[PDB]
C-alpha cells in the first residue's frame, strides 16, 4: 500500500511492484 | 444482479490492512 514515488515498475491495487513486468494473458497462479 | 446491487448498498498508526486476493 505505498505509491512508490519517493524510493521495471507496475502499479497494482495491493501496492507496487518492483522487479516484475505485466503479462496481458493470464494463467492459473 | 439486482438481488447483490440491494445487498451491496445495505452492508456499510502502524495498523495497515492488507486487500483480499
Ligand atoms: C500515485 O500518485 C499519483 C500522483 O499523486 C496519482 O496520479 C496516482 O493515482 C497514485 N496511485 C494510485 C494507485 O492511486
Known amino acids: 500500500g505505498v505509491n512508490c514515488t519517493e524510493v521495471n515498475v ?3 491495487r495491493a501496492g ?5 513486468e505485466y503479462v496481458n494473458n493470464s494463467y492459473e497462479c | 444482479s439486482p438481488i447483490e446491487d440491494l ?15
Do not use: E, R, S, Y
Open chain 1, 10 to 12: 507496475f502499479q497494482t
Open chain 2, 7 to 21: 445487498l451491496f448498498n445495505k452492508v456499510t498508526n502502524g495498523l495497515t490492512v492488507l486487500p483480499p486476493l
Open chain 1, 16 to 20: 507496487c511492484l518492483i522487479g516484475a
